[PDB]
Design a protein around this ligand. Structure first.
Ligand code: CU
Ligand code: CU
Length: 128
């Protein structure tokens, strides 16, 4: 199974920058050996939402409208690592972020589906 471990979340202020990293190890259960990645956030009193996603190759990414501009999702050169660069935090952003691996290819990556493995969660609080 794909072991996902995140870190980098914590205390900041509105207009700052913060960077979350998601390490990945182990083989997967489905597919031919690959997997796409994505980030989700849990906000108190609201349902879980899909915030960013990247195809296994990096040919295309997807962002939720309210983060486009400000957030970017990438993967470094040797890879198991996924990053989420958060710039110009607004306070609404305030929540617990999660990274998840998708073992089987999907036609539309804006879709919340196929995420078999989940990381543990990092609280991000934006004070004013
Ligand atoms: Cu390969
Ligand atoms: Cu593939």
């Amino acid at each position: 199974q794909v072991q996902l471990q995140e870190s980098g979340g914590g205390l900041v202020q509105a207009g700052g920058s913060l960077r979350l990293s998601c390490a990945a190890s182990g083989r997967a259960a489905s597919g031919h050996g690959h997997y796409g990645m994505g980030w989700f956030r849990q906000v108190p009193g609201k349902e879980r939402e899909f915030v960013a996603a990247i195809r296994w190759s990096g040919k295309e990414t997807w962002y939720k409208d309210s983060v486009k501009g400000r957030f970017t999702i990438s993967r470094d050169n040797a890879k198991t690592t996924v990053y989420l660069q958060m710039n110009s935090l607004k306070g609404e952003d305030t929540a617990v972020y999660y990274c998840a691996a998708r073992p089987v290819r999907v036609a539309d990556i804006s879709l919340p589906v196929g995420f078999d493995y989940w990381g543990q969660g990092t609280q991000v609080t934006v004070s004013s």
